[PDB]
């Protein structure tokens, strides 16, 4: 298990031109966003080619 660092640094430039770091509390996701109806295409599918059914067009 890899622990989330929690804080992240982003670069912000002022009106004069001085750059510094905004520290943002940021956590990562854990569960996939499957509730969307759109399908990305990248998910691990289940193999079902070994199963024997009544398909006479296929082989045993």
């Amino acid at each position: 298990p890899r622990r989330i660092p929690g804080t992240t640094k982003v670069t912000y430039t002022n009106k004069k031109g001085r750059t510094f770091s905004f520290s943002v509390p940021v956590s990562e996701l854990t569960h996939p966003q499957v509730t969307l109806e759109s399908a990305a295409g990248t998910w691990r599918e289940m193999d079902t080619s070994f199963c024997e059914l009544g398909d006479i067009e296929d082989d045993m």
């Binding site: 929690g6 770091s21 520290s23």
Partner: protein, 257 residues
């Protein structure tokens, strides 16, 4: 001595050396008043006056002898004053310096990136039915936003309930990014008090470890709308995110334009 300077900010006297304020000489802070030139005119010390609060200058001058800046979390007013004073003086870029490293980025061990909000409402609702006169619990934990680690929260709930829950079978798993679930078969009265306490204990321990603090809570108990005998005990907690020790994007309004 000639190295010491008597600086009076807001009516309070401070004494410090010349190398303390000139630790960053290129900044507009130490450039706009001549520390070494006034030491040749006045033999004892240089007398300068500032228009800042003395409690705010303690954080800025205390930073210059330490190279460490810690913004106040409990006092939101002084936190707004340190950010504005170090922005107009050009001194905040050396306290929190920018640094980006492409070679240390590791996306293979990380999921998608979301931002934690400043407030967090958590709803803990279990539905208590009567299975042959004995209570059964179907418990649901719901968060208000994404990012909160539910998989690590569930195993903390799961480890505590292996010693305290006496039933036939029970599960605990994650159903959504913001939702978790728990079912039990015919729990007793005294074991249900161990169930409601241990789940609400490990939940608020998980949110304090995330960097939040409890603002308010709420408990209610009411029957279901459709079914009469189905009870609904809802523990609703509200968590306020603690202020970070460094600067935040929420302090951007206090930066000054």
């Amino acid at each position: 001595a000639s190295d010491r300077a008597v600086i009076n900010a807001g009516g309070r006297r401070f004494e410090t050396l010349f190398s303390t304020l000139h630790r960053y000489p290129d900044t507009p802070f130490a450039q706009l008043f001549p520390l070494p030139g006034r030491g040749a005119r006045q033999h004892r010390g240089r007398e300068f006056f500032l228009d800042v609060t003395p409690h705010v200058f303690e954080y800025i001058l205390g930073f210059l002898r330490t190279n460490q800046l810690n913004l106040p979390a409990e006092n939101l007013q002084i936190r707004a004053e340190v950010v504005y004073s170090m922005n107009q003086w050009g001194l905040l870029e050396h306290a929190f310096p920018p640094e980006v490293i492409e070679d240390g980025e590791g996306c293979s061990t990380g999921g998608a990136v979301v931002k934690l909000p400043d407030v967090c409402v958590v709803q803990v609702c279990d539905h208590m039915q009567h299975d042959q006169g004995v209570k059964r619990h179907a418990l649901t934990i719901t968060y208000g936003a994404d990012g909160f680690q539910l998989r690590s929260l569930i195993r903390r709930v799961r480890r505590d309930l292996e010693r305290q829950l006496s039933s036939t079978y029970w599960q605990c798993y994650q159903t959504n990014e913001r939702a978790a679930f728990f079912v039990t078969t015919k729990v007793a009265n005294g074991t249900a008090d161990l169930l409601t306490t241990s789940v609400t204990q490990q939940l608020v321990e998980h949110t304090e470890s995330m960097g939040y603090s409890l603002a308010s809570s709420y408990v209610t108990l009411s029957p279901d709308v459709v079914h009469t005998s189905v009870r609904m005990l809802i523990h609703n907690f509200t968590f306020r995110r603690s202020r970070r020790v460094e600067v935040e994007p929420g302090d951007g309004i206090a930066l000054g334009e």
